[PDB]
């Protein structure tokens, strides 16, 4: 059972000009990605202190970087707090509105997209470097959720029946043709290393079989 939704204009209209401009610096949306995992553990940590029983479904906080080149996939994965149905089709969304229409601004002004991750949509510089994104995600007391988007103005959710996943979410990057630069070992490597290095959580490097 598949529901497919539209994006918010404003949504719609970043996403195209994240795929339509020209902006060789196409890395950085990796710690966008990270960033993203660490703040959905520190949430899940600072929750837990009040309620243990929220770390029921997994105790271990982490960030697993899995490159796959038969699948031409990168997926980042969490232990965080995950995303409810809400999040995904509704509430993201709404807080991203007015971070899009800043974003938007400041690049009229003169910033660059690498700046993204400070108006609260670094998510999306995703894709930059991906056709389709594919996120699993699963938040105590909600079901497991499969979102995906190829852009193109809509998005679809779906409850997952896949290997379930405790609690957390992951991101899988289905890669553009001309990207497979980020399946490479020596590439994540180096990419961690400059842009997170000092992120507070064990972040496991998997290398391809
Ligand atoms: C400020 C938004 C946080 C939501 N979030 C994102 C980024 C994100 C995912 C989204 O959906 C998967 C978004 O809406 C499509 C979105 O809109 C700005 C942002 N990653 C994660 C993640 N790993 N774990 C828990 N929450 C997350």
Known sequence: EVETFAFQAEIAQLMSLIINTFYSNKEIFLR????????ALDKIRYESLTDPSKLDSGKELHINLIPNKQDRTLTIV????????????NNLGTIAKSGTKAFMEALQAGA?????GQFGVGFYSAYLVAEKVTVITKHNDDEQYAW????????????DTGEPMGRGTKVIL???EDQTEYLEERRIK?????????????????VEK
Do not use: C, W
Request: proline letters at 2%; hydrophobic letters at 40%; charged letters at 20%.
């Open 32 to 39: 966008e990605l990270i960033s993203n995992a660490s703040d």
């Open 78 to 89: 969490d232990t965080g707090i995950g995303m409810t149905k809400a999040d995904l089709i």
């Open 112 to 116: 660059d997209i690498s700046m993204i």
């Open 148 to 159: 995906e988007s190829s852009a193109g103005g809509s998005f679809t959710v779906r409850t």
């Open 174 to 176: 289905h890669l553009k």
């Open 190 to 206: 180096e990419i961690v290393k400059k842009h997170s290095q000092f992120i507070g959580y064990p972040i496991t490097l998997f």
